[PDB]
Amino acid sequence: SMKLYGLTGACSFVPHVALEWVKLRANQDYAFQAVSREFIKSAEYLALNPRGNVPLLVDGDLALTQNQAIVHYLDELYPEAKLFGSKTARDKAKAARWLAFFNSDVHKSFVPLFRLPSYAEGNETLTKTIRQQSAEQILEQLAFANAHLENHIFFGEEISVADAYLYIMLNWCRLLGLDFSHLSQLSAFMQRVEADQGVDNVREQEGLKG
Amino acid sequence: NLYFQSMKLYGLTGACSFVPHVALEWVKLRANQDYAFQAVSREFIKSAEYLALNPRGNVPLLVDGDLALTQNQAIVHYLDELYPEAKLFGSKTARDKAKAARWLAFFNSDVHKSFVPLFRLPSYAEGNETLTKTIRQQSAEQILEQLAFANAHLENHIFFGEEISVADAYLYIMLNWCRLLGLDFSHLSQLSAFMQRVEADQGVDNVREQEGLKG
Numbered sequence: 001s002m003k004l005y006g007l008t009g010a011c012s013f014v015p016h017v018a019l020e021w022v023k024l025r026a027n028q029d030y031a032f033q034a035v036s037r038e039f040i041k042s043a044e045y046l047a048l049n050p051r052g053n054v055p056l057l058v059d060g061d062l063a064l065t066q067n068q069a070i071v072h073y074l075d076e077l078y079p080e081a082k083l084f085g086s087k088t089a090r091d092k093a094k095a096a097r098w099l100a101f102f103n104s105d106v107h108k109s110f111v112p113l114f115r116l117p118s119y120a121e122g123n124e125t126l127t128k129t130i131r132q133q134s135a136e137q138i139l140e141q142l143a144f145a146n147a148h149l150e151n152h153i154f155f156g157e158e159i160s161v162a163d164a165y166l167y168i169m170l171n172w173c174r175l176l177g178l179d180f181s182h183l184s185q186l187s188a189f190m191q192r193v194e195a196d197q198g199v200d201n202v203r204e205q206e207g208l209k210g
Numbered sequence: 211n212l213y214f215q216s217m218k219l220y221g222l223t224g225a226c227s228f229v230p231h232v233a234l235e236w237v238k239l240r241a242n243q244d245y246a247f248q249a250v251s252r253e254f255i256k257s258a259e260y261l262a263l264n265p266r267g268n269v270p271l272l273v274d275g276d277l278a279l280t281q282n283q284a285i286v287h288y289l290d291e292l293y294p295e296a297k298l299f300g301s302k303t304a305r306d307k308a309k310a311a312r313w314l315a316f317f318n319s320d321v322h323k324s325f326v327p328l329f330r331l332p333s334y335a336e337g338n339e340t341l342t343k344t345i346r347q348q349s350a351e352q353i354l355e356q357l358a359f360a361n362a363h364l365e366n367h368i369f370f371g372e373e374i375s376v377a378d379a380y381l382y383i384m385l386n387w388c389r390l391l392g393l394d395f396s397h398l399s400q401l402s403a404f405m406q407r408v409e410a411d412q413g414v415d416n417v418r419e420q421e422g423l424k425g
């Protein structure tokens with residue numbers, strides 16, 4: 001049985017949702033191990049993942065990192081679970097495109113809001129500037145996602161791992177006090193994602209409600 | 211013939227779009243499917259005509275009929291689904307493919323961004339000589355720490371797939387960026403040998419020719 005190491009509420013939410021969909025749709029249970037930021041820098045965890053971060057999926061002798069690799073792997077093993085919102089190559093790729101945008105381009109913009117560059121620490125003006133630029137970048141990227149939702153209810157034909165990724169980044173925005181109320185589709189999107197049983201179960205497990 | 215055109219890749223020569231270019235060349239060589247390559251300028255990708263195809267104004271972009279597909283990882287996973295026989299991830303087996311996909315993701319999502327400040331200095335450092343030097347040094351250090359991790363893998367593996375893969379193509383082009391930037395990685399001893407192995411691949415060789423990367 002596979003095991004996922006994750007930080008609750010972090011990007012590892014997405015493979016956690018994927019695993020729960022596999023559970024609900026393909027009848028395969030899995031283990032979730034919530035980790036602390038202290039544990040992931042521990043000698044024990046570093047021996048499994050020298051990069052000292054999450055997600056990490058363990059499936060027997062396979063220790064697999066990277067959000068996109070994990071979910072593409074699960075999709076290959078369990079095509080019937082429709083992790084990318086469809087079974088057809090074209091539609092899966094379109095959802096994979098959104099996942100990749102979120103994971104490679106958007107998540108990136110958040111990094112300075114979670115961990116300030118070393119050169120900025122103690123510099124009030126530079127710190128403010130870096131945080132401002134991150135906020136502006138995020139809002140510009142969210143506007144692009146929001147525009148898509150003007151004509152589509154999800155980032156797949158049905159709900160997909162891309163939707164889970166945007167959802168969690170919007171939860172980060174709420175926690176950081178980065179408002180997105182001007183992007184008119186995002187609130188309803190969050191409600192639709194929250195209505196999915198797999199998402200609901202994971203939000204419960206990771207302590208994300210309320 | 212008149213109803214189905216080859217796939218078309220828009221790319222910047224020598225940039226990250228090299229990777230799906232190599233993927234398409236491998237599909238050509240191994241699955242006998244030709245494709246079109248359109249080299250673009252940095253000016254053309256900010257043009258009105260191009261923004262109509264790709265509002266994000268960057269590359270790669272793969273057009274296959276009515277599908278306009280962006281993102282390196284999405285493009286290569288798509289081609290792998292259509293042409294599994296091409297072994298774009300260095301294997302046909304799900305676990306071996308996933309391990310290669312993990313390296314591709316590391317390169318595309320984690321390492322590539324470390325280069326960003328070296329290609330385009332953050333605006334707030336413009337005109338600030340000391341901050342500019344600190345940013346560039348720190349970015350160079352970050353890249354080398356990430357490359358050291360790739361180097362370690364190569365201590366007991368010939369490639370990042372079981373056979374050569376899109377992950378190898380991604381590291382390769384980043385090491386080409388390092389050379390072009392003057393970022394010395396020669397203390398990581400597996401990397402030069404790795405570049406030679408990658409360059410020996412027929413598909414890589416073909417794409418390097420097409421993109422003008424030989425010297």
Ligand SMILES: N[C@@H](CCC(=O)N[C@@H](CS)C(=O)NCC(=O)O)C(=O)O
Pocket residue numbers: 007010011012037040052053054055065066067068103315316319320
């Ligand atoms: N490209 C990686 C990025 C993973 C990543 O950024 N992980 C972060 C957030 S989930 C993390 O573990 N941060 C804690 C730390 O690095 O100490 C992936 O997609 O898996």
Ligand SMILES: N[C@@H](CCC(=O)N[C@@H](CS)C(=O)NCC(=O)O)C(=O)O
Pocket residue numbers: 100101104105222225226227252267268269270280281282283318
């Ligand atoms: N996450 C995107 C990143 C695309 C990207 O970084 N593209 C660069 C090339 S390395 C680009 O288009 N740069 C535009 C320019 O240099 O003007 C992907 O994987 O496709």
Ligand SMILES: [Cl-]
Pocket residue numbers: 101266280281
């Ligand atoms: Cl994109």
